[PDB]
Amino acid sequence: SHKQLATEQYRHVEMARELAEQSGASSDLETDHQAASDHLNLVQTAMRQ
Amino acid sequence: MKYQQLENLECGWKWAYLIRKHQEGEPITKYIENSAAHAAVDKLIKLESEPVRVLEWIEQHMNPDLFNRMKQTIRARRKRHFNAEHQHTRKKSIDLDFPVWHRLSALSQRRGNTLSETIVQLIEDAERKEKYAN
Amino acid sequence: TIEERVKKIIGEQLGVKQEEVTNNASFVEDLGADSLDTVELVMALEEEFDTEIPDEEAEKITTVQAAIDYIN
Amino acid sequence: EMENVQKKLRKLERDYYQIREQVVSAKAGWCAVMRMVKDNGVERRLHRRE
Amino acid sequence: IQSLTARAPVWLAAQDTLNQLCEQSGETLASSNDVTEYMQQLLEREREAT
DNA sequence: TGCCGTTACAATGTAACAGTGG
DNA sequence: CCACTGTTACATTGTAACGGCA
Ligand SMILES: *P(=O)(O)OCC(C)(C)[C@@H](O)C(=O)NCCC(=O)NCCS
């Protein structure tokens, strides 16, 4: 059980790392989508005028 | 019933206890007259090496007021005899200065725990505080 | 020195004295300790040093010298 | 959930520790009695393996 | 294993009794027939000594 | 209830350590 | 040095009071 728990801890660490990677990806996507919304707004405005 | 009772052992215990009490001056027998008491004590003294007859001796001449004390003494003797086999089941006796004991007993009564449980909890909390700081 | 632990415990676990054990000999057959006795010896060594020894490492202590070799 | 199992492992470890002192003390006590009883007492008299 | 364990104590007590009985004699017994011839020799020695 | 384990004491005896002064 | 004293950490035995259980 000691070896099993240590190995499960290592597996847990690996999944935590990959989800940290996904969190970073989400932040980058958030920046990109902010830019996209700005572009949409711009376009809208342009259309109106 | 947790500890099995052995006759040739508990009877020797009872004989030794009664001889000790008699040597200490306790009135072993129910006979106020000194002659009958001495005769019964002599019967007991010569009765050594006998469980099946020391039990009968107790049933017949034992002082009524010592029955409870003898019973609880034998209970404690049995428990200690069975617990003294293994280290973890033994008990360690210490002496505590009166203020320290007073505070510890105050805590134990307050929390409803025994002295052992109270000290175990306190030591665990001390270790936890160490880890908190460390 | 610290080896005085091992060379003591071994004797206390096998009935031999401090000098009786020879580094060239083997516990399994040259000391008279059978499987159970050797298990007891290794487990007492584990207890003394407040450490752990898995089965695999533990099986390589059949010789006298090994008892210190893994220790020091 | 797994931290609870880690604590249970610590409990099992302390139980193992306790059993280990019991066993080592038993063997320490045994040593001397074997040494004395090897004066032909243990050959067949005491060791009533039955 | 449990069947053998149940059988064990009887066999062990038997072995101990037989070993004591044979060692008391100069001979070591190995068969029921052999015990019978030992009985015959015992009878011969008895009928002589008497 | 009466037995039975269990706790928390009390009283006394000892070994071991630390002090103190001759 | 050495002896005698003070102290701590036990052991050993006994007892009263709770609480569980038939
Ligand atoms: P040997 O006749 O002295 O018997 C030794 C033994 C089988 C009783 C036992 O102590 C032993 O040596 N077992 C080998 C190790 C083992 O089985 N480990 C199990 C770990 S879960």
UniProtKB/TrEMBL annotation, chain B:
<dbReference type="Pfam" id="PF06303">
    <property type="entry name" value="MatP"/>
</dbReference>
<keyword id="KW-0963">Cytoplasm</keyword>
<dbReference type="GO" id="GO:0043565">
    <property type="term" value="F:sequence-specific DNA binding"/>
</dbReference>
<dbReference type="InterPro" id="IPR035375">
    <property type="entry name" value="MatP_C"/>
</dbReference>
<dbReference type="InterPro" id="IPR035087">
    <property type="entry name" value="MatP_N"/>
</dbReference>
<keyword id="KW-0132">Cell division</keyword>
<dbReference type="InterPro" id="IPR013321">
    <property type="entry name" value="Arc_rbn_hlx_hlx"/>
</dbReference>
<feature type="domain" description="MatP C-terminal ribbon-helix-helix">
    <location>
        <begin position="88"/>
        <end position="134"/>
    </location>
</feature>
<dbReference type="GO" id="GO:0005737">
    <property type="term" value="C:cytoplasm"/>
</dbReference>
<comment type="subunit">
    <text>Homodimer.</text>
</comment>
<dbReference type="InterPro" id="IPR038339">
    <property type="entry name" value="MatP_N_sf"/>
</dbReference>
<dbReference type="GO" id="GO:0051301">
    <property type="term" value="P:cell division"/>
</dbReference>
<keyword id="KW-0238">DNA-binding</keyword>
<feature type="domain" description="MatP N-terminal">
    <location>
        <begin position="2"/>
        <end position="85"/>
    </location>
</feature>
<keyword id="KW-0131">Cell cycle</keyword>
<dbReference type="GO" id="GO:0006355">
    <property type="term" value="P:regulation of DNA-templated transcription"/>
</dbReference>
<dbReference type="Pfam" id="PF17414">
    <property type="entry name" value="MatP_C"/>
</dbReference>
<dbReference type="InterPro" id="IPR009390">
    <property type="entry name" value="MatP"/>
</dbReference>
<comment type="similarity">
    <text>Belongs to the MatP family.</text>
</comment>
<protein>
    <recommendedName>
        <fullName>Macrodomain Ter protein</fullName>
    </recommendedName>
</protein>
<comment type="function">
    <text>Required for spatial organization of the terminus region of the chromosome (Ter macrodomain) during the cell cycle. Prevents early segregation of duplicated Ter macrodomains during cell division. Binds specifically to matS, which is a 13 bp signature motif repeated within the Ter macrodomain.</text>
</comment>
From TrEMBL, chain D:
<comment type="similarity">
    <text>Belongs to the SMC family. MukB subfamily.</text>
</comment>
<protein>
    <recommendedName>
        <fullName>Chromosome partition protein MukB</fullName>
    </recommendedName>
</protein>
<feature type="coiled-coil region">
    <location>
        <begin position="1"/>
        <end position="22"/>
    </location>
</feature>
<comment type="function">
    <text>Plays a central role in chromosome condensation, segregation and cell cycle progression. Functions as a homodimer, which is essential for chromosome partition. Involved in negative DNA supercoiling in vivo, and by this means organize and compact chromosomes. May achieve or facilitate chromosome segregation by condensation DNA from both sides of a centrally located replisome during cell division.</text>
</comment>
<comment type="subunit">
    <text>Homodimerization via its hinge domain. Binds to DNA via its C-terminal region. Interacts, and probably forms a ternary complex, with MukE and MukF via its C-terminal region. The complex formation is stimulated by calcium or magnesium. Interacts with tubulin-related protein FtsZ.</text>
</comment>
